[PDB]
Write a structure and sequence with these properties.
part of a larger assembly; 3 chains; A alpha+beta (153); B mainly beta (394); C alpha+beta (60); B: 394 residues; mainly beta; nine-stranded antiparallel sheet; 6 helices; 17 strands; 10% helix; C: 60 residues; alpha+beta; two-stranded antiparallel sheet; 3 helices; RNA-binding
RNA sequence: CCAAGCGUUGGAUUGUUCACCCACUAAUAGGGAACGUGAGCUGGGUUUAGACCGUCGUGAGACAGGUUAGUUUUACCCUACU
RNA sequence: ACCUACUAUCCAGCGAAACCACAGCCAAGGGAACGGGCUUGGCGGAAUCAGCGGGGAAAGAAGACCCUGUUGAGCUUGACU
RNA sequence: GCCGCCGCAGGUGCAGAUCUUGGUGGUAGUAGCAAAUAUUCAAACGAGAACUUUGAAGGCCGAAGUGGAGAAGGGUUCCAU
RNA sequence: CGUGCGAAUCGGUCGUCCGACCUGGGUAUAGGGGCGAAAGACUAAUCGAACCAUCUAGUAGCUGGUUCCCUCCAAAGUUUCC
RNA sequence: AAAUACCGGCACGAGACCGAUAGUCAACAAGUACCGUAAGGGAAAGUUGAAAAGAACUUUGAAGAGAGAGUUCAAGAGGGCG
């Protein structure tokens, strides 16, 4: 299918895509904007050290009441967190992207993640019980993802 | 409609921005006013809160019922290693205030003082004042320098000095020595600056700033206490036991209309660690440190004239949560701000002091050393052995 | 690897509480294909699955 | 007269607003703030449904005539203040 | 005053509601006579974590009190049939 | 699959009705997963062990039982792959 | 607790406890009707007249709403009788 | 006996009608899913393409999810798909 952008030139550049992923849309969108301006082997590294709490993700848009921490000044900010399932997901996705560079015949060490986007997806309903005999909803907020990498020394 | 019976109110409405102080060392907000009549001296100094104990004295004040009788008054112990100047600093008089004019430093600045310029001494090449000193022994840095000492000699009117403490000599964990401006009050700025230079790199002891039975003022930071409630912070009435959502409160915030809520009214929030300036604390004795001579070491600080035993102010088991006190000290009547181990800026008074409770000369008859860590009964270790006999260890 | 079952048929031959049964750890492979009462009546004879002795309440 | 800088309290009977008495005191001046103030409290009074009298009506019923018992909901949004 | 238990607080995983013209710093003035928006003055410096319960004539229910309606029902007798 | 001109015909034009039906926001990654004491160390199955399985420790129910079996009612939820 | 665990619970303290005691099954009483040691109580979360369908789109001097443009003229709250 | 009546039944033929929130409650396993002890109450829900030609082989992954091959005029028609 198509991606929110092309690749600038198709010969030097690889894709990967994620349909209906059971993660939080927002936590994902926030971790997918730190990752953005980094090399692959800075990225892989930065997403083990989120998982192991030595480097936080900045909560910039979606910061309703979100805490404050010591590893966020690093991002000149004050709010931030350590979303672990969001990482363990888009640390799968890489493996696929990485795994399409050699099946063209390209340099896996020069692949600069250009494109990476995060979209809302169809909600999954389940239900939950509140006083005076009533029933609210209790719904799921999944997502799709995409990304596009490109070779540069 | 009105308040049925009256009261007074809850707390002081000058002191009210009850925030955690911007600085950890007490700032001197205001030194005295000089008169060119009297000779040069420093004003301020630096100690550390190390303790508290009794005294006993025989009092003279004719009139009262404690005349020639023997009270006990309480005291604090402030430990004062003699301070080390490293520079001077000039200020000029203006119509927007008091602009700081020119600054200079000594050739040799210690490493507890090269520790005061860094956030991290572990990784840093210790390169502060490396290119600077250089000037002090080349023939093109004796002239530029004394161009400028001859510029303060004209333009500047206020003159100050700068002194680093000595944390090689205290029993604390830390090693970062405090730099602190101090005003030099005295003769015309010519003299004021003949004296300063001459003292770069020297030591200045507490014998020289302060004297016995003086009235000093005591500046520092409070013992801190946490985000605390309205009942602890402001000292209101509790509420009565029937109340649906709590009784350590104010029950009426404000009226209906001037429909805001006013900075006058009492609220939750941070309790303590403010800055603060108490006054008129007396000086009952200036101590002497542990000087060695002729083999033996001499350690009679606490030796009053009325019991001459061998003891120093140090108590059995040491002072608690602090250390042992070797370095020369001052003995303040009354209590002072801050925890133990916390740094206590001194000062003369602004206010020229004549009453009777000022001019009261003091000599003592007892100084306490019975261990404070427990509930003590013994004044000195040897005296114990003599009371108790030999134990199952001997 | 999984013996809610072999612990059941045990406690129905030893005529006791499942509490009292003892299923030798080491030989968890020899006891987790048994799976039918005869093949447990063996392993009781053999000394893998054993009864524990009754907890003392001293009347002393 | 200038002066509202600083205060103007503890108890008995009463649901009190009001009243009156004891005692201490420099003095126990008066008022506003939606008759300041219930998502601050208390519900003791009035002002639902049960019950009893004391006047009125043949009666269902009625009382500024008195009585007993009667469930006080929400804050996570903006501001304000800390 | 101080202590203990559980929350509150901070982190991973899961994750609902009521409510919402547009919104949200004050004086006084007029005005359907008690303005967040108008007029005259004072002023206005990203984004936010914990609390509080002054203000939104806060939310919650087409006032249960009173009056009207040529709208009713439960009770009672000398109202009429 | 559709439109202009002359004439006919009507279930013919929305901002609103605490209007009908369907879909989506701000609030918000916030309120919150707090009643009846309590767990920890080793192994073995596995792509994944704070929670499942075995073995060892420390605990609770304490025969008016968190034990053993029935009647109404449920209707296969029983048992192994 | 009061957007609860509960459309009436839970906790400590409480009333009775060999007698007009306290409970299971089978049975009789049906809506101006039943049953009531009598509060207008109870009659399947409903009671000073239960629930389901129809007559029915019941009637309203009273609330709320009432869909395209330009052009021209533009009022009334006063008089008798209800 | 006839000339009259016929929103139930068995077959038929038309329409200046409505076109999937319309038109019957019902274009489809509807008087069906489900609710009420029972009388009774009662929905939502049409569309790949001309043809299944419904994507062999390779490759990352434990798996869903992917990268390239390929059918079609098109997957910018990929099994709830104009």
């Amino acid at each position: 299918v198509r991606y929110s952008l092309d690749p600038e030139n198709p010969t030097k550049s690889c894709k990967s895509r994620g349909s209906n992923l059971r993660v939080h849309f927002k936590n994902t969108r926030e971790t997918a904007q730190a990752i953005k301006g980094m090399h692959i082997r800075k990225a892989t590294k930065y997403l083990k050290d989120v998982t192991l709490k030595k480097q936080c993700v900045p909560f910039r848009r979606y910061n309703g009441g979100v805490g404050r921490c010591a590893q966020a000044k690093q991002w000149g900010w004050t709010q931030g967190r350590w979303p672990k399932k969001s990482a363990e997901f888009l640390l799968h996705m890489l493996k696929n992207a990485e795994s399409n560079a050699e099946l063209k015949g390209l340099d896996v060490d020069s692949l600069v993640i250009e494109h990476i986007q995060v979209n809302k997806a169809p909600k999954m309903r389940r239900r939950t019980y509140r006083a005076h005999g009533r029933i609210n909803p209790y719904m799921s907020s999944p997502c799709h993802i995409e990304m596009i990498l490109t070779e540069k020394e | 409609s009105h308040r049925k019976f009256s009261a007074p109110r809850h707390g002081s409405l000058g002191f009210l921005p009850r925030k955690r102080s911007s600085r950890h060392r007490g700032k001197v907000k205001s030194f005295p006013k000089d008169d060119p009549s009297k000779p040069v001296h420093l004003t301020a100094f630096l100690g550390y809160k190390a303790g508290m104990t009794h005294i006993v004295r025989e009092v003279d004040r004719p009139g009262s019922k404690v005349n020639k009788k023997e009270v006990v008054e309480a005291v604090t112990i402030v430990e004062t290693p003699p301070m080390v100047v490293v520079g001077i600093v000039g200020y000029v008089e203006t119509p927007r205030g008091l602009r700081t004019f020119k600054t200079v430093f000594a050739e040799h600045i210690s490493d507890e003082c090269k520790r005061r310029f860094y956030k991290n001494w572990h990784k840093s090449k210790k390169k502060a004042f490396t290119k600077y000193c250089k000037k002090w022994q080349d023939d093109a840095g004796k002239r530029q320098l004394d161009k400028d000492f001859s510029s303060m000699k004209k333009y500047c009117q206020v003159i100050r000095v700068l002194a680093h403490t000595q944390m090689r000599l205290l029993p604390l964990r830390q090693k970062k020595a405090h730099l602190m401006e101090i005003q030099v009050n005295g003769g015309t700025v010519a003299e004021k600056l003949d004296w300063a230079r001459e003292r770069l790199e020297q030591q200045v002891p507490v014998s020289q700033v302060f004297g016995q039975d003086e009235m000093i003022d005591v500046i520092g930071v409070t013992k801190g206490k946490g985000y605390k409630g309205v009942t602890s912070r402001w000292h209101t009435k509790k509420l009565p036991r029937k109340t649906h959502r709590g009784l350590r409160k104010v029950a009426c915030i404000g009226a209906w209309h001037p429909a805001r809520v006013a900075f006058s009214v009492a609220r939750a929030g941070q309790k303590g660690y403010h800055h603060r300036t108490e006054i008129n604390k007396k000086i009952y004795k200036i101590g002497q440190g542990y000087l060695i001579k002729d083999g033996k070491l001499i350690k009679n600080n606490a030796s009053t004239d009325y019991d001459l035993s061998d003891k120093s102010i140090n108590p059995l088991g040491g002072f608690v949560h602090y250390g042992e006190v070797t370095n020369d000290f001052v003995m303040l009547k009354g209590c002072v701000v801050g925890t133990k181990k916390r740094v206590l800026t001194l000062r003369k008074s602004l206010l020229v002091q004549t009453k009777r409770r000022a001019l009261e000369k003091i000599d003592l008859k007892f100084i306490d050393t019975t261990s404070k860590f427990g509930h003590g009964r013994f004044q000195t270790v040897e005296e114990k052995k003599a009371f108790m006999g030999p134990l199952k260890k001997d | 690897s999984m013996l809610r079952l072999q612990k059941r048929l045990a406690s129905s031959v030893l005529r006791c509480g499942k509490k009292k049964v003892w299923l030798d750890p080491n030989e968890t492979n020899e006891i987790a294909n048994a799976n039918s009462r005869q093949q447990i009546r063996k392993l009781i004879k053999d000394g893998l699955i054993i009864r524990k002795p009754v907890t003392v309440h001293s009347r002393a």
